[PDB]
Scaffold this motif. Structure first.
Motif, short mmCIF file in Angstrom:
data_model
loop_
_atom_site.label_atom_id
_atom_site.label_comp_id
_atom_site.label_asym_id
_atom_site.label_seq_id
_atom_site.Cartn_x
_atom_site.Cartn_y
_atom_site.Cartn_z
N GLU A 44 -1.80 -6.08 -24.19
CA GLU A 44 -2.22 -4.95 -25.00
C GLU A 44 -1.42 -3.70 -24.65
O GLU A 44 -0.92 -2.99 -25.53
N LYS A 45 -1.28 -3.42 -23.35
CA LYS A 45 -0.47 -2.28 -22.92
C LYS A 45 0.97 -2.42 -23.38
O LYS A 45 1.62 -1.43 -23.73
N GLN A 46 1.50 -3.65 -23.37
CA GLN A 46 2.89 -3.86 -23.77
C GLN A 46 3.11 -3.49 -25.23
O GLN A 46 4.20 -3.01 -25.58
N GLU A 47 2.10 -3.68 -26.08
CA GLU A 47 2.22 -3.26 -27.47
C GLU A 47 2.43 -1.75 -27.57
O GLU A 47 3.24 -1.29 -28.38
N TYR A 48 1.70 -0.98 -26.77
CA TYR A 48 1.91 0.47 -26.76
C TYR A 48 3.25 0.83 -26.12
O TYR A 48 3.90 1.79 -26.55
N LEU A 49 3.67 0.08 -25.10
CA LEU A 49 4.98 0.32 -24.51
C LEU A 49 6.09 -0.03 -25.49
O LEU A 49 7.12 0.65 -25.53
N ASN A 50 5.91 -1.10 -26.27
CA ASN A 50 6.88 -1.44 -27.30
C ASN A 50 6.94 -0.35 -28.36
O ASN A 50 8.03 0.09 -28.76
N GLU A 51 5.78 0.10 -28.83
CA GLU A 51 5.73 1.15 -29.85
C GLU A 51 6.43 2.41 -29.37
O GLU A 51 7.21 3.02 -30.12
N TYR A 52 6.16 2.83 -28.14
CA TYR A 52 6.84 4.01 -27.61
C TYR A 52 8.34 3.75 -27.46
O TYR A 52 9.15 4.65 -27.67
#
Length: 62
Positions: A44-52
């Motif tokens: 889940e955190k990686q999705e936000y890291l990908n988006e950023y």
């Protein structure tokens, strides 16, 4: 300018935290959001890291 992964999550989830208890003060919302982020899976955190990461690439190309 792109928003940090942690705080874009805070923006996306702020209103529902206020909805769970409108008597909550601003500092109480931030404390709770910190707990909610801690409960997140690594994917889940990686999705936000990908988006950023995508957000950073776009802004730097402008």
């Amino acid at each position: 300018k792109p928003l940090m992964p942690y705080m874009r999550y805070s923006r996306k989830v702020w209103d529902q935290v206020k909805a769970s208890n409108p008597d909550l003060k601003l500092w109480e919302i931030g404390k709770i959001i910190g707990g909610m982020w801690r409960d997140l899976t690594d994917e889940e955190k990686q999705e936000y890291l990908n988006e950023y990461e995508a957000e950073k690439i776009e802004y730097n190309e402008s």
